[PDB]
């Protein structure tokens, strides 16, 4: 009610942008603003997740709290000139924003009505560089399901075991797995982070040198990075046993230049069925032939020089799944591990086993 603060525009922008990340209830469209002991806290929530930003206050201030429309407040702050001093105070049930000769009066909702996230205890904690969390997410995110009825597939598995953190994502047709050493002995734990949580967690990594502190409870996950705290509910489901689906002992190995392979699959794709995306691979001695056809009886054929010595074989794949893997890999050469035409194929960088991709074929 007596909440007062003055802060430079540039010290508000990134915090305002981060908290607006997570309606039906009017208060969920607001940001909770709190002034307490030299800090301004900003909180945004969708009930499933919340983002809290802390801004140090070097200019005079008075304690208190309020809720203000998020988009309107951010747009005012963003719309002000570079270097503007933003003076904020309450006057009745209105929030007053003043800068230069610009005055704004915004509607408020009491701070006491802002939804608090349910208290929980962390069961596993670890610290990680931001780049490690970024690599784990980026290497696997494209493999998560898109609004699948097996709801546990729409998120990403976060699994700790020994000194390692691993991410796993699948849609039941293709899978991605990334394992990274974290240098801290961890209890064995597995949780599913929802799609929106993964996006928010990725969006919070500024690409700087501040480490990420992760706390995982039974039904919640918390990530602290610099002056930001992101909390998300976990997906209440059981992830499939992905260990079962990695080819254990493949008898066929193919190696090819990533760029040439990606370009050939990209051109073949043009003439694949628009909904089904099926392409045929014919593997023979040091050769890969890629074919595609559609209901219009149009046909594409690509012939490439590869490294391959095994038995001749034909295998069908959804070309979008193959292209997704080739675009996720950023290496000179790729290696493909195969058994037969009705079994999964493993794809990986020919010089790194950090990330593995498993694609189930299509019936030809």
């Amino acid at each position: 009610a007596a909440m007062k603060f003055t802060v430079e525009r540039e010290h508000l922008l990134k915090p305002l942008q981060q908290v607006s990340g997570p309606p039906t209830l009017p208060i969920l469209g607001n940001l909770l603003l709190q002034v307490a002991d030299g800090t301004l806290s900003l909180t945004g929530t969708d009930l499933e997740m919340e983002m809290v930003a802390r801004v140090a206050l070097v200019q005079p201030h008075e304690p208190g709290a309020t809720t203000v429309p998020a988009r309107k407040f951010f747009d005012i702050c963003r719309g002000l000139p570079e270097g503007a001093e933003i003076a904020v105070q309450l006057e009745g049930e209105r929030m007053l924003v003043r800068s230069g000769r610009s005055r704004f009066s915004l509607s408020t909702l009491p701070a006491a009505d802002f939804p608090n996230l349910d208290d929980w205890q962390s069961e596993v904690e670890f610290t990680l560089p931001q780049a490690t969390m970024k690599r784990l997410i980026e290497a696997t995110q494209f493999s998560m399901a898109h609004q699948d009825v097996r709801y546990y597939l729409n998120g990403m598995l976060f699994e700790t075991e020994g000194e390692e953190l691993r991410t796993v994502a699948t849609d039941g047709h293709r899978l991605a797995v990334c394992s990274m050493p974290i240098g801290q002995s961890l209890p064995s734990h597995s949780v599913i982070v929802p799609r929106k949580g993964v996006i928010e967690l990725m969006r919070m990594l500024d690409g700087g040198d501040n480490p990420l502190r992760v706390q995982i409870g039974s039904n919640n996950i918390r990530a602290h990075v610099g002056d930001f705290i992101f909390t998300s509910k976990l997906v209440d489901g059981r992830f499939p046993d992905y260990r079962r689906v990695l080819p254990k002992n493949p008898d066929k190995h193919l190696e090819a230049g990533c760029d040439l392979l990606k370009q050939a699959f990209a051109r073949a794709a043009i003439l694949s069925n628009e909904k089904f995306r099926g392409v045929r691979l014919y593997v023979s001695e040091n050769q890969l032939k890629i074919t595609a056809n559609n209901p219009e009886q149009e046909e594409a054929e690509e012939i490439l020089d590869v490294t391959y010595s095994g038995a001749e074989m034909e295998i069908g794949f959804n070309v979008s799944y193959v292209l997704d893997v080739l675009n996720a890999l950023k290496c000179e050469n790729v290696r493909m591990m195969l058994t037969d035409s009705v079994s999964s194929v493993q794809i990986e960088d020919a010089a790194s086993q950090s990330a593995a991709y498993v694609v189930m074929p299509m019936r030809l």
Partner: peptide, 5 residues
């Protein structure tokens, strides 16, 4: 399209 599981 075949299933992993």
């Amino acid at each position: 399209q075949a299933d992993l599981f």
